[PDB]
Every structure is written in structure tokens, then in C-alpha cells.
């Protein structure tokens, strides 16, 4: 049904696309579509225009960066499947940049708190053990 | 071997311990030294921490479900781990254990949340700006025969 069926398979294709990019039903017809998608997206990695066009853009930035770039990709009123896929590609690039920066920043912030507590509360005690080597002098378990 | 060596070594062990319990990201810090000494301690934390999985007292201490931003959570919990004024290696390792479970928890929500909100923008734009054209092709099956390179 070329009315609603489009979006159900779009949401499905997109999610499968993103998920793949991040690693580096899904029935019969769907499988074969996903495959071509993967092929087109893989080809896009070598598309120097696309690559330039994304490069000219400061990521981990608001929806205003997305909707503007998405717009320039279709300024000329023309459409094709390569252009549609390149939209997905962009969305994936944005997800991947986010992960690449927001995730290590998450990890760093929490490492921050831990080491903060460790200094203000444990540094002293650890000194008395002879340092971190007291750790191998330990085969017990905490109880509270 | 105190004062400054404690913090440098402390951070290295923390990093490696967390990266261990995760599924690799480039933290852009100093790489974990691959020497005898720190490979020893690292393998010590793992043994101690492997036990902590079955330590339900700690699992209770640590337990919460998106009740709050991990921040004041972390400090209240970490203080509570040391409220009775007693120290030993088990609560030091357990502090490291907690840190990684909190990272994992945060990831398990931040990350999907991120992919969902970005998918909505794409699925928006596809509905606003591309849906009709796709109809005019008879759906996505046209994609199976596309072998071009888009231009702009
Ligand atoms: Cl080919
Ligand atoms: Pr502080
Ligand atoms: Pr809209």
C-alpha cells in the first residue's frame, strides 16, 4: 500500500541502517531492501561531494543543522534514490558523531566523580597500605 | 610510591576497568600502561570485581532505575558505601564497580534516546519532503534497481 506502508518500511530500513553503521521482522522483501540500502550507503562513503558536503558542517549541533542540510540536498526539486539514501547516510553520520563524542564524555564525567571521591576520601587510607599494591594483599569481600 | 603515583595509577586502573566492562571507545586519555606492574593490579581488580557480581549488598547499594541524573545519585551512594568510616580494598574496588555499572546504565538510555530523536527528524523530512515521490515510484522496491551516484 503506497500510502502508509512506506513509513513503516522507512522506519525499519533506517534503524537497520543506523544499527549497521554503529557496528564498525526483517522478512524476505525487507531483507532484500536492506541489502541494497547497505550497498548504496557503502558506495556513499566514497562520494566526495557527499563527503565534502557533510564536512562543511559542524556536527553535534541542533536540529537546525540537520533540517538545513537535508534541505540543500533537495534544493533543486529533483529526486532520486541515491539522494534519498544520502539522507539516511547523513542521519547515520550524525548518530555516529554523537556517539563518538557524547559517549566518551559520559565516561569521562563519571570517571571524574569516582576519582574525585577517591582523592577526597580514600587517598589517605591507600597511602597507609603501601599504595595500590595492598590490592594484591586482598582476598576478602566487603559486607557493610 | 604515594601522593601522585596513587592518582595516575588510580585513573589508569579505573579507565581499563570500565573499558573492560563495556561493549573500546576512544576516551582520548593516556593509554593504559602495558607493563608488569599495572597488568598485575588490573588482573587483581578483575578478580575482586568478578566476585562483586554476586555481592547483593552492593547490588542493593547500587540499585536504582533512572530515579535521577546519575550525579547526586553517585555521591549519595558512594558516601553511603563509606558512611561507617571503615575502609578496605573491597569497598575501593566496589567504588570502581559502581562507576562502571552507572556508565552502563546511562548508556543504555542516553544512546537509544539519541538514535530515536535523530530518526524522528529523518522520518519527519521523509514524510514532509520525499513521501510523494516514493509513492510515484510505487514504493521502496525501486531502490533494488538503483545503481547511480547522486550529484547535487
Ligand atoms: Cl555494484
Ligand atoms: Pr571535589
Ligand atoms: Pr514536521
CATH of residue A81's domain is 1.10.437.10
* Spatial contact of A86 and A50, defined as CB atoms under 8 Å apart: yes
Q: C-alpha cell of B57?
A: 549488598
Domain count for chain A: 1
Count CB atoms within 10 A of the CB of residue A23: 6
Cβ distance A47 to B149 less than 8 Å, yes or no, reads: yes
Whole-angstrom distance, CA of residue A5 vs CA of residue B40: 57
Residue B97, number of CB atoms within 10 A of its CB: 27
Asked if B75 and A117 touch (Cβ cutoff 8 Å), the reply is: yes
Q: Which residues, chain by chain, have CB under 5 Å from ion ligand 3? A: B 124
Chain A residues whose beta carbon lies within 8 Å of the beta carbon of residue B22 = 107
Q: After which residues is the backbone of chain A broken at C–N > 2.5 Å?
A: 24
Taking the C-alpha atoms of residue A117 and residue A3, their distance in angstroms, rounded to an integer, is 57
Do the chains contact at B95 and A118, CB–CB below 8 Å? Answer: yes
Minimal Cα distance from A6: which residue of B?
Answer: B139
* Nearest one of B96, B140, B116, B123 to A35, comparing CA atoms: B140
Asked if A126 contacts A109 with a C-beta cutoff of 8 angstroms, the reply is: no
- Round to the nearest angstrom and report the end-to-end CA distance of chain B: 62
Domain of A136 in residue numbering reads as: 1-144
Q: Resolution of this entry in Å?
A: 2.8
Instruction: Determine phi and psi for B146, rounding to 5 degrees.
Output: -90, 120
Q: Residue A92, class by beta-carbon neighbours within 10 Å (0-12 exposed, 13-18 middle, 19+ buried)?
A: buried
| CB A13 within 8 Å of CB B142 | no
* Residues A50, A97, A55, B129, Cα dihedral to 10°: 50
Mutate to test the interface with A, among B122, B128, B133 (most CBs of A within 10 A): B122
Q: Please answer yes or no on whether B134 and A2 come within 8 Å at the CB atom.
A: yes
In the reported structure, the alpha carbon of residue A112 is separated from the centroid of ligand 1 by a whole-number distance in angstroms of 48
* Sequence-ordered alpha helix ranges (H) in A45-137: 48-55, 63-72, 81-117, 123-128
B128-135 CB contacts, 8 Å cutoff, 24+ apart: B129/A70, B129/A74, B130/A74, B130/A79, B130/A84, B130/A87, B131/A6, B131/A7, B133/A79, B134/A2, B134/A6, B134/A84, B135/A2, B135/A3, B135/A6
Contact yes or no for B13/B38 (Cβ under 8 A): yes
Using an 8 Å CB-CB cutoff, list chain B residues near A38. none
Which residues in chain A have Cβ-Cβ distances shorter than 8 Å to B11? 111, 115
Amino acid at each position: 500500500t503506497s500510502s502508509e506502508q512506506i513509513m513503516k518500511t522507512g522506519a525499519l530500513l533506517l534503524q537497520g541502517f543506523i544499527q549497521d553503521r554503529a557496528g564498525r521482522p526483517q522478512d524476505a522483501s525487507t531483507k532484500k531492501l536492506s541489502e541494497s540500502l547497505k550497498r548504496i550507503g557503502d558506495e556513499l562513503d566514497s562520494n566526495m561531494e557527499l563527503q565534502r558536503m557533510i564536512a562543511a558542517v559542524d556536527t553535534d549541533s541542533p536540529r537546525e543543522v540537520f533540517f538545513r542540510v537535508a534541505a540543500d540536498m533537495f534544493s533543486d526539486g529533483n529526486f532520486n534514490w541515491g539522494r534519498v539514501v544520502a539522507l539516511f547516510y547523513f542521519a547515520s553520520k550524525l548518530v555516529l558523531k554523537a556517539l563518538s563524542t557524547k559517549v566518551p564524555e559520559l565516561i569521562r564525567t563519571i570517571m571524574g566523580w569516582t576519582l574525585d571521591f577517591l582523592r577526597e576520601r580514600l587517598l589517605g587510607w591507600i597511602q597507609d597500605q603501601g599504595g595500590w599494591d595492598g590490592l594484591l594483599s586482598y582476598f576478602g569481600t566487603p559486607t557493610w
